[PDB]
PDB file of C-alpha atoms (C1' of nucleotides) in Angstrom:
ATOM      1  CA  UNK V   7      -0.939  10.930   5.070  1.00 35.41           C
ATOM      2  CA  UNK V   8      -2.196   8.282   7.294  1.00 37.50           C
ATOM      3  CA  UNK V   9      -3.376   7.938  11.145  1.00 35.61           C
ATOM      4  CA  UNK V  10      -3.284   4.978  12.728  1.00 32.11           C
ATOM      5  CA  UNK V  11      -6.098   3.753  15.536  1.00 31.49           C
ATOM      6  CA  UNK V  12      -5.647   1.060  17.965  1.00 35.24           C
ATOM      7  CA  UNK V  13      -8.357  -0.154  20.104  1.00 37.80           C
ATOM      8  CA  UNK V  14      -7.894  -1.389  23.813  1.00 36.00           C
ATOM      9  CA  UNK V  15     -10.375  -3.608  25.512  1.00 35.97           C
ATOM     10  CA  UNK V  16     -10.497  -4.492  29.081  1.00 37.00           C
ATOM     11  CA  UNK V  17     -14.361  -5.229  29.460  1.00 37.61           C
ATOM     12  CA  UNK V  18     -14.751  -1.919  30.941  1.00 34.87           C
ATOM     13  CA  UNK V  19     -14.945   1.625  29.866  1.00 32.80           C
ATOM     14  CA  UNK V  20     -12.257   3.905  31.347  1.00 34.18           C
ATOM     15  CA  UNK V  21     -12.033   7.726  30.427  1.00 34.85           C
ATOM     16  CA  UNK V  22      -9.595   9.020  27.999  1.00 33.83           C
ATOM     17  CA  UNK V  23      -7.886  11.523  30.085  1.00 32.98           C
ATOM     18  CA  UNK V  24      -8.199   8.787  33.356  1.00 33.01           C
ATOM     19  CA  UNK V  25      -6.601   6.151  31.054  1.00 30.55           C
ATOM     20  CA  UNK V  26      -3.591   8.717  30.223  1.00 30.73           C
ATOM     21  CA  UNK V  27      -3.115   9.371  33.746  1.00 32.26           C
ATOM     22  CA  UNK V  28      -3.239   5.303  34.560  1.00 31.66           C
ATOM     23  CA  UNK V  29      -0.878   4.453  31.460  1.00 33.60           C
ATOM     24  CA  UNK V  30       1.713   7.097  32.973  1.00 33.43           C
ATOM     25  CA  UNK V  31       1.642   5.306  36.564  1.00 31.38           C
ATOM     26  CA  UNK V  32       2.176   1.876  35.444  1.00 31.19           C
ATOM     27  CA  UNK V  33       5.295   2.387  32.924  1.00 27.34           C
ATOM     28  CA  UNK V  34       6.414   5.283  35.125  1.00 27.99           C
ATOM     29  CA  UNK V  35       9.231   3.075  36.782  1.00 23.73           C
ATOM     30  CA  UNK V  36      10.520   1.307  33.425  1.00 22.04           C
ATOM     31  CA  UNK V  37      10.807   2.210  29.734  1.00 21.94           C
ATOM     32  CA  UNK V  38      10.640   6.190  30.190  1.00 27.11           C
ATOM     33  CA  UNK V  39      11.627   6.962  26.523  1.00 26.57           C
ATOM     34  CA  UNK V  40       8.628   5.015  25.502  1.00 26.84           C
ATOM     35  CA  UNK V  41       6.499   6.988  27.739  1.00 25.76           C
ATOM     36  CA  UNK V  42       8.207  10.327  26.587  1.00 29.50           C
ATOM     37  CA  UNK V  43       7.243   9.719  22.846  1.00 26.71           C
ATOM     38  CA  UNK V  44       3.638   8.629  23.685  1.00 28.36           C
ATOM     39  CA  UNK V  45       2.716  11.824  25.623  1.00 29.01           C
ATOM     40  CA  UNK V  46       4.626  14.266  23.275  1.00 27.77           C
ATOM     41  CA  UNK V  47       7.397  15.069  25.831  1.00 29.41           C
ATOM     42  CA  UNK V  48      10.321  16.975  25.346  1.00 31.73           C
ATOM     43  CA  UNK V  49      13.300  14.841  25.400  1.00 30.32           C
ATOM     44  CA  UNK V  50      15.074  16.321  28.124  1.00 32.99           C
ATOM     45  CA  UNK V  51      12.627  17.046  31.036  1.00 27.73           C
ATOM     46  CA  UNK V  52       8.628  16.055  31.616  1.00 25.63           C
ATOM     47  CA  UNK V  53       7.146  19.336  29.965  1.00 22.81           C
ATOM     48  CA  UNK V  54       4.998  17.946  26.789  1.00 23.48           C
ATOM     49  CA  UNK V  55       5.775  19.786  23.396  1.00 23.09           C
ATOM     50  CA  UNK V  56       4.130  22.765  22.336  1.00 22.58           C
ATOM     51  CA  UNK V  57       3.339  21.729  18.726  1.00 22.19           C
ATOM     52  CA  UNK V  58       0.659  19.508  17.570  1.00 25.33           C
ATOM     53  CA  UNK V  59       0.158  16.099  19.477  1.00 22.09           C
ATOM     54  CA  UNK V  60       1.620  13.321  17.175  1.00 22.49           C
ATOM     55  CA  UNK V  61       0.048  10.416  19.537  1.00 21.94           C
ATOM     56  CA  UNK V  62      -3.369  11.158  21.340  1.00 22.95           C
ATOM     57  CA  UNK V  63      -5.856   9.135  23.437  1.00 21.77           C
ATOM     58  CA  UNK V  64      -9.496   9.084  22.376  1.00 18.62           C
ATOM     59  CA  UNK V  65     -12.821   7.042  23.018  1.00 16.72           C
ATOM     60  CA  UNK V  66     -13.609   3.385  23.116  1.00 17.18           C
ATOM     61  CA  UNK V  67     -16.926   1.789  24.281  1.00 17.31           C
ATOM     62  CA  UNK V  68     -15.093  -1.232  26.147  1.00 17.92           C
ATOM     63  CA  UNK V  69     -11.923   0.755  27.420  1.00 17.27           C
ATOM     64  CA  UNK V  70      -9.623   3.357  25.326  1.00 13.97           C
ATOM     65  CA  UNK V  71      -8.058   3.920  21.893  1.00 13.92           C
ATOM     66  CA  UNK V  72      -4.777   5.325  20.468  1.00 12.94           C
ATOM     67  CA  UNK V  73      -4.432   8.004  17.472  1.00 10.99           C
ATOM     68  CA  UNK V  74      -1.276   8.357  16.037  1.00 10.40           C
ATOM     69  CA  UNK V  75      -0.911  10.637  13.224  1.00 10.07           C
ATOM     70  CA  UNK V  76       1.781  10.244  10.481  1.00 10.98           C
ATOM     71  CA  UNK V  77       4.650   7.935  10.264  1.00 11.76           C
ATOM     72  CA  UNK V  78       6.111   9.079  13.086  1.00 12.61           C
ATOM     73  CA  UNK V  79       2.918   8.461  15.335  1.00 10.22           C
ATOM     74  CA  UNK V  80       2.166   5.292  13.493  1.00 10.39           C
ATOM     75  CA  UNK V  81       5.621   3.750  14.254  1.00  9.54           C
ATOM     76  CA  UNK V  82       5.368   5.510  17.934  1.00 11.05           C
ATOM     77  CA  UNK V  83       2.242   3.439  18.382  1.00 12.25           C
ATOM     78  CA  UNK V  84       3.805   0.226  16.789  1.00 13.83           C
ATOM     79  CA  UNK V  85       6.428  -0.163  19.295  1.00 12.29           C
ATOM     80  CA  UNK V  86       4.375   0.888  22.144  1.00 12.71           C
ATOM     81  CA  UNK V  87       1.351  -1.506  21.602  1.00 12.75           C
ATOM     82  CA  UNK V  88       3.036  -4.519  22.837  1.00 10.16           C
ATOM     83  CA  UNK V  89       4.246  -3.404  26.446  1.00 11.80           C
ATOM     84  CA  UNK V  90       1.131  -1.493  27.076  1.00 10.72           C
ATOM     85  CA  UNK V  91      -0.798  -4.557  26.404  1.00 10.38           C
ATOM     86  CA  UNK V  92       1.436  -6.587  28.639  1.00  8.93           C
ATOM     87  CA  UNK V  93       1.024  -3.780  31.413  1.00  9.67           C
ATOM     88  CA  UNK V  94      -2.719  -3.944  31.163  1.00 11.59           C
ATOM     89  CA  UNK V  95      -2.626  -7.694  31.305  1.00  8.68           C
ATOM     90  CA  UNK V  96      -0.389  -7.773  34.559  1.00  9.60           C
ATOM     91  CA  UNK V  97      -2.348  -5.046  36.153  1.00 12.06           C
ATOM     92  CA  UNK V  98      -5.790  -6.878  35.539  1.00 13.45           C
ATOM     93  CA  UNK V  99      -4.294 -10.223  36.185  1.00 11.11           C
ATOM     94  CA  UNK V 100      -2.930  -9.136  39.680  1.00 11.40           C
ATOM     95  CA  UNK V 101      -6.406  -8.305  40.826  1.00 13.15           C
ATOM     96  CA  UNK V 102      -9.492 -10.447  40.326  1.00 11.58           C
ATOM     97  CA  UNK V 103      -9.921 -13.506  38.218  1.00  9.66           C
ATOM     98  CA  UNK V 104      -8.635 -12.077  34.954  1.00  9.96           C
ATOM     99  CA  UNK V 105      -9.798 -10.502  31.730  1.00  8.94           C
ATOM    100  CA  UNK V 106      -8.658 -11.057  28.096  1.00 13.31           C
ATOM    101  CA  UNK V 107      -7.093  -8.000  26.892  1.00 11.70           C
ATOM    102  CA  UNK V 108      -8.456  -7.504  22.976  1.00 10.35           C
ATOM    103  CA  UNK V 109      -6.635  -5.336  20.656  1.00 13.63           C
ATOM    104  CA  UNK V 110      -8.079  -3.883  17.152  1.00 13.56           C
ATOM    105  CA  UNK V 111      -6.221  -1.700  14.607  1.00 13.02           C
ATOM    106  CA  UNK V 112      -7.189   0.700  11.540  1.00 14.70           C
ATOM    107  CA  UNK V 113      -4.928   2.512   9.432  1.00 14.65           C
ATOM    108  CA  UNK V 114      -7.321   5.470   8.123  1.00 12.23           C
ATOM    109  CA  UNK V 115      -6.057   7.467   5.416  1.00 10.62           C
ATOM    110  CA  UNK V 116      -6.442  11.311   5.260  1.00  9.91           C
ATOM    111  CA  UNK V 117      -7.721  13.589   2.439  1.00  9.21           C
ATOM    112  CA  UNK V 118      -9.475  16.761   1.517  1.00  7.47           C
ATOM    113  CA  UNK V 119     -11.220  18.274  -1.414  1.00  9.40           C
ATOM    114  CA  UNK V 120     -12.727  21.451  -1.937  1.00  9.04           C
ATOM    115  CA  UNK V 121     -16.226  21.210  -3.235  1.00  7.47           C
ATOM    116  CA  UNK V 122     -18.471  24.754  -3.984  1.00  9.80           C
ATOM    117  CA  UNK V 123     -21.444  23.416  -1.600  1.00 11.16           C
ATOM    118  CA  UNK V 124     -21.614  23.785   1.932  1.00 12.07           C
ATOM    119  CA  UNK V 125     -21.238  20.108   4.202  1.00 12.41           C
ATOM    120  CA  UNK V 126     -22.296  19.769   7.980  1.00 14.94           C
ATOM    121  CA  UNK V 127     -20.122  18.231  10.596  1.00 17.28           C
ATOM    122  CA  UNK V 128     -20.688  17.697  14.421  1.00 16.84           C
ATOM    123  CA  UNK V 129     -18.214  17.648  16.742  1.00 16.06           C
ATOM    124  CA  UNK V 130     -18.351  16.641  20.621  1.00 15.17           C
ATOM    125  CA  UNK V 131     -16.858  17.762  23.746  1.00 15.57           C
ATOM    126  CA  UNK V 132     -15.382  20.767  22.016  1.00 16.89           C
ATOM    127  CA  UNK V 133     -13.214  23.147  24.411  1.00 19.22           C
ATOM    128  CA  UNK V 134     -13.176  26.606  23.426  1.00 19.71           C
ATOM    129  CA  UNK V 135     -11.790  28.954  26.214  1.00 17.51           C
ATOM    130  CA  UNK V 136      -8.480  28.826  27.840  1.00 21.74           C
ATOM    131  CA  UNK V 137      -7.867  32.644  28.604  1.00 19.21           C
ATOM    132  CA  UNK V 138      -9.807  35.275  29.676  1.00 17.14           C
ATOM    133  CA  UNK V 139      -9.758  36.972  26.370  1.00 17.57           C
ATOM    134  CA  UNK V 140     -11.794  34.275  24.831  1.00 16.60           C
ATOM    135  CA  UNK V 141     -14.349  34.480  27.580  1.00 19.03           C
ATOM    136  CA  UNK V 142     -14.586  37.889  26.671  1.00 15.45           C
ATOM    137  CA  UNK V 143     -15.057  37.071  23.230  1.00 14.88           C
ATOM    138  CA  UNK V 144     -17.560  34.571  23.921  1.00 11.96           C
ATOM    139  CA  UNK V 145     -20.278  36.748  25.682  1.00 13.33           C
ATOM    140  CA  UNK V 146     -21.085  38.668  22.417  1.00 15.37           C
ATOM    141  CA  UNK V 147     -22.061  36.364  19.774  1.00 16.59           C
ATOM    142  CA  UNK V 148     -20.707  38.436  16.661  1.00 16.36           C
ATOM    143  CA  UNK V 149     -17.312  38.624  18.047  1.00 14.71           C
ATOM    144  CA  UNK V 150     -17.479  35.081  19.508  1.00 21.07           C
ATOM    145  CA  UNK V 151     -18.620  33.712  15.842  1.00 22.06           C
ATOM    146  CA  UNK V 152     -15.279  34.897  13.797  1.00 20.79           C
ATOM    147  CA  UNK V 153     -12.962  33.596  16.701  1.00 20.71           C
ATOM    148  CA  UNK V 154     -14.585  30.305  16.360  1.00 22.75           C
ATOM    149  CA  UNK V 155     -14.268  30.458  12.545  1.00 24.04           C
ATOM    150  CA  UNK V 156     -10.728  31.299  13.157  1.00 20.83           C
ATOM    151  CA  UNK V 157     -10.322  28.405  15.596  1.00 22.87           C
ATOM    152  CA  UNK V 158     -11.665  25.848  13.232  1.00 20.30           C
ATOM    153  CA  UNK V 159      -9.925  26.685  10.073  1.00 20.37           C
ATOM    154  CA  UNK V 160      -6.424  27.028  12.336  1.00 18.39           C
ATOM    155  CA  UNK V 161      -6.958  23.577  13.845  1.00 21.55           C
ATOM    156  CA  UNK V 162      -7.788  22.355  10.110  1.00 20.95           C
ATOM    157  CA  UNK V 163      -4.539  24.192   9.061  1.00 23.16           C
ATOM    158  CA  UNK V 164      -2.351  22.877  11.863  1.00 19.55           C
ATOM    159  CA  UNK V 165      -3.308  19.466  11.435  1.00 20.08           C
ATOM    160  CA  UNK V 166      -2.968  19.245   7.638  1.00 21.87           C
ATOM    161  CA  UNK V 167       0.552  20.925   8.208  1.00 21.06           C
ATOM    162  CA  UNK V 168       1.742  18.442  11.040  1.00 20.17           C
ATOM    163  CA  UNK V 169       0.469  15.633   8.902  1.00 22.69           C
ATOM    164  CA  UNK V 170       2.531  16.924   5.752  1.00 20.20           C
ATOM    165  CA  UNK V 171      -0.294  17.039   3.064  1.00 16.00           C
ATOM    166  CA  UNK V 172      -1.477  20.224   1.392  1.00 15.45           C
ATOM    167  CA  UNK V 173      -4.538  21.850   2.351  1.00 14.23           C
ATOM    168  CA  UNK V 174      -6.468  24.374  -0.042  1.00 17.03           C
ATOM    169  CA  UNK V 175      -6.335  27.728   1.541  1.00 15.72           C
ATOM    170  CA  UNK V 176      -9.436  29.096  -0.249  1.00 16.53           C
ATOM    171  CA  UNK V 177     -11.740  27.304   2.394  1.00 24.55           C
ATOM    172  CA  UNK V 178     -14.896  28.976   3.967  1.00 25.39           C
ATOM    173  CA  UNK V 179     -16.084  27.942   7.292  1.00 25.55           C
ATOM    174  CA  UNK V 180     -19.545  28.700   9.324  1.00 24.89           C
ATOM    175  CA  UNK V 181     -20.770  27.527  12.558  1.00 23.56           C
ATOM    176  CA  UNK V 182     -24.502  27.088  13.235  1.00 26.59           C
ATOM    177  CA  UNK V 183     -24.750  26.266  16.884  1.00 26.33           C
ATOM    178  CA  UNK V 184     -23.760  24.001  19.773  1.00 23.31           C
ATOM    179  CA  UNK V 185     -26.309  22.258  21.857  1.00 22.37           C
ATOM    180  CA  UNK V 186     -24.687  22.609  25.566  1.00 26.55           C
ATOM    181  CA  UNK V 187     -21.880  24.579  27.437  1.00 29.94           C
ATOM    182  CA  UNK V 188     -20.046  22.714  29.994  1.00 29.82           C
ATOM    183  CA  UNK V 189     -16.775  22.910  31.781  1.00 31.57           C
ATOM    184  CA  UNK V 190     -13.531  20.381  31.729  1.00 27.60           C
ATOM    185  CA  UNK V 191     -11.164  19.818  34.503  1.00 28.65           C
ATOM    186  CA  UNK V 192      -7.585  19.474  34.074  1.00 28.97           C
ATOM    187  CA  UNK V 193      -7.019  17.439  37.098  1.00 32.10           C
ATOM    188  CA  UNK V 194      -9.798  15.707  39.554  1.00 32.36           C
ATOM    189  CA  UNK V 195     -10.494  17.990  42.514  1.00 33.66           C
ATOM    190  CA  UNK V 196      -9.202  21.075  41.172  1.00 33.65           C
ATOM    191  CA  UNK V 197     -10.599  24.602  41.179  1.00 29.67           C
ATOM    192  CA  UNK V 198      -9.614  25.576  37.615  1.00 31.17           C
ATOM    193  CA  UNK V 199     -11.992  24.649  34.616  1.00 28.95           C
ATOM    194  CA  UNK V 200     -11.970  25.251  31.160  1.00 30.19           C
ATOM    195  CA  UNK V 201     -15.357  26.345  29.449  1.00 31.20           C
ATOM    196  CA  UNK V 202     -16.327  23.943  26.382  1.00 32.75           C
ATOM    197  CA  UNK V 203     -18.924  23.265  23.866  1.00 32.76           C
ATOM    198  CA  UNK V 204     -20.877  20.250  22.997  1.00 33.56           C
ATOM    199  CA  UNK V 205     -22.505  18.856  20.085  1.00 31.44           C
ATOM    200  CA  UNK V 206     -21.313  21.918  17.968  1.00 29.51           C
ATOM    201  CA  UNK V 207     -22.379  21.975  14.231  1.00 32.02           C
ATOM    202  CA  UNK V 208     -20.010  23.458  11.716  1.00 32.43           C
ATOM    203  CA  UNK V 209     -20.522  23.943   7.689  1.00 31.96           C
ATOM    204  CA  UNK V 210     -17.349  23.320   5.509  1.00 31.85           C
ATOM    205  CA  UNK V 211     -17.262  23.833   1.904  1.00 28.34           C
ATOM    206  CA  UNK V 212     -14.749  21.072   1.408  1.00 27.91           C
ATOM    207  CA  UNK V 213     -15.152  17.670   2.294  1.00 28.77           C
ATOM    208  CA  UNK V 214     -12.721  15.327   4.912  1.00 27.26           C
ATOM    209  CA  UNK V 215     -12.016  11.925   4.558  1.00 26.22           C
ATOM    210  CA  UNK V 216     -10.498  10.818   8.164  1.00 24.91           C
ATOM    211  CA  UNK V 217      -9.853  11.349  11.405  1.00 26.74           C
ATOM    212  CA  UNK V 218      -9.919  15.060  12.062  1.00 29.34           C
ATOM    213  CA  UNK V 219      -8.801  16.898  15.518  1.00 30.45           C
ATOM    214  CA  UNK V 220      -9.861  20.598  16.240  1.00 30.17           C
ATOM    215  CA  UNK V 221      -9.416  23.028  19.145  1.00 33.04           C
ATOM    216  CA  UNK V 222      -7.630  22.742  22.207  1.00 33.30           C
ATOM    217  CA  UNK V 223      -6.495  19.656  24.521  1.00 31.11           C
ATOM    218  CA  UNK V 224      -6.099  17.336  21.727  1.00 30.37           C
ATOM    219  CA  UNK V 225      -4.068  14.958  23.617  1.00 27.88           C
ATOM    220  CA  UNK V 226      -7.137  14.277  26.270  1.00 26.70           C
ATOM    221  CA  UNK V 227      -9.356  12.882  23.518  1.00 25.26           C
ATOM    222  CA  UNK V 228     -11.119  16.141  23.343  1.00 27.53           C
ATOM    223  CA  UNK V 229     -12.914  17.137  20.254  1.00 25.91           C
ATOM    224  CA  UNK V 230     -12.173  14.732  17.421  1.00 28.63           C
ATOM    225  CA  UNK V 231     -14.182  12.765  15.768  1.00 27.50           C
ATOM    226  CA  UNK V 232     -14.344  10.496  12.409  1.00 26.36           C
ATOM    227  CA  UNK V 233     -15.434  12.421   9.311  1.00 24.11           C
ATOM    228  CA  UNK V 234     -15.490   9.185   7.049  1.00 24.50           C
ATOM    229  CA  UNK V 235     -18.516   8.004   9.178  1.00 25.23           C
ATOM    230  CA  UNK V 236     -20.107  11.592   8.795  1.00 26.65           C
ATOM    231  CA  UNK V 237     -20.345  11.674   5.399  1.00 26.41           C
ATOM    232  CA  UNK V 238     -24.206  10.582   5.067  1.00 27.58           C
ATOM    233  CA  UNK V 239     -24.473   9.735   8.476  1.00 27.99           C
ATOM    234  CA  UNK V 240     -27.479  11.877   9.441  1.00 32.25           C
TER     235      UNK V 240
ATOM    236  C1'  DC T   6     -18.980   5.960   5.512  1.00 33.74           C
ATOM    237  C1'  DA T   7     -13.163   4.318   6.844  1.00 30.10           C
ATOM    238  C1'  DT T   8      -9.769  -0.669   8.052  1.00 27.32           C
ATOM    239  C1'  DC T   9      -9.529  -5.580   8.292  1.00 29.03           C
ATOM    240  C1'  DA T  10      -8.090  -9.699   6.079  1.00 29.58           C
ATOM    241  C1'  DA T  11      -5.266  -7.878   1.236  1.00 30.95           C
ATOM    242  C1'  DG T  12      -2.730 -16.711   0.908  1.00 29.20           C
ATOM    243  C1'  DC T  13      -0.585 -20.758   2.963  1.00 28.12           C
ATOM    244  C1'  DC T  14       1.760 -25.474  -0.045  1.00 29.17           C
ATOM    245  C1'  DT T  15       3.468 -28.733  -3.098  1.00 33.05           C
ATOM    246  C1'  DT T  16       3.479 -30.416  -6.729  1.00 34.94           C
ATOM    247  C1'  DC T  17       8.012 -27.736 -10.028  1.00 34.54           C
ATOM    248  C1'  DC T  18       7.775 -35.250 -15.214  1.00 32.68           C
ATOM    249  C1'  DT T  19       8.049 -40.143 -16.458  1.00 37.06           C
ATOM    250  C1'  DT T  20      10.311 -43.531 -21.661  1.00 38.00           C
ATOM    251  C1'  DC T  21      11.665 -44.714 -25.610  1.00 39.47           C
ATOM    252  C1'  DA T  22      12.353 -44.145 -29.946  1.00 42.23           C
ATOM    253  C1'  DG T  23      17.994 -40.946 -30.211  1.00 41.17           C
ATOM    254  C1'  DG T  24      16.806 -43.865 -39.342  1.00 40.52           C
ATOM    255  C1'  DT T  25      17.243 -46.810 -43.026  1.00 40.37           C
ATOM    256  C1'  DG T  26      18.883 -47.666 -48.786  1.00 41.37           C
ATOM    257  C1'  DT T  27      21.315 -45.928 -52.551  1.00 41.70           C
ATOM    258  C1'  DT T  28      23.726 -43.043 -54.897  1.00 40.67           C
ATOM    259  C1'  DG T  29      29.724 -43.705 -54.303  1.00 43.67           C
ATOM    260  C1'  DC T  30      29.807 -40.173 -63.145  1.00 44.08           C
ATOM    261  C1'  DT T  31      29.760 -40.427 -67.962  1.00 45.09           C
ATOM    262  C1'  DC T  32      32.870 -38.616 -72.521  1.00 45.13           C
ATOM    263  C1'  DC T  33      36.130 -35.999 -75.121  1.00 44.21           C
ATOM    264  C1'  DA T  34      39.270 -32.950 -76.084  1.00 44.69           C
ATOM    265  C1'  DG T  35      43.768 -36.808 -82.912  1.00 43.50           C
ATOM    266  C1'  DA T  36      44.590 -35.670 -87.504  1.00 43.05           C
ATOM    267  C1'  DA T  37      46.685 -37.754 -91.192  1.00 42.32           C
ATOM    268  C1'  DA T  38      45.529 -41.314 -95.305  1.00 41.09           C
ATOM    269  C1'  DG T  39      42.631 -43.464 -98.299  1.00 42.05           C
ATOM    270  C1'  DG T  40      38.610 -43.466-100.261  1.00 41.95           C
ATOM    271  C1'  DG T  41      34.596 -40.815-101.784  1.00 41.30           C
ATOM    272  C1'  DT T  42      31.766 -36.576-104.533  1.00 43.42           C
ATOM    273  C1'  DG T  43      30.524 -31.701-105.550  1.00 42.50           C
ATOM    274  C1'  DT T  44      30.958 -27.613-107.094  1.00 42.65           C
TER     275       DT T  44
END
DNA sequence: CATCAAGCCTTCCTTCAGGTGTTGCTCCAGAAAGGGTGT
């Protein structure tokens, strides 16, 4: 259907995972149901859900941003916005002179159509390795290529299934190359790290008309970009 | 290339003129009786 994008401006850039950690800490004391819905927690305990994250953070040049996929995530985002905005207002008025928190909103629709010609899409900060077997597949390009093709196709399929719209199942994908290889950290000052691709280029015969999320670590603002910008971006 | 506004308001009838004159029925619904005249 549609995905709603909420932009939060504080005058300074904070990273999406750091904003996720910061957002949880300020509201930990009060209103726990709002935090449970925002982070996609299970309704009983603190453990997050296994399924597709409806609410995820993203990147914003002067702050961070929220993505709510579908009507449920849009409603969760709709009820979350004033409490979170007041939380940054009190947090940034507690210290310093004070800064005006500035909000923005968009309701981006989602669409997909199959075309008989290849189309190019580039994704930045792409996490691909999460067990040892995926590290073994990444050593040889032939057996890592088909793994990446299946990962991209299953990512598109699970996002189409979670948003509630039908995706044609005759899509063919192709992967050209990635600019860099870098690690990501789950928590700061932790020895554990996950391998990741940087500026990866993919080619799909079909076209996409909105925000699309691919791969793992979707709730940390990793590996989603606006396709509607990328039609004819060059 | 996608949203982002994607109207608000308040007006939202007013006054008389809102007939006048005239027509407003007529007539006949008998049948001898005394004269003619025409076949």
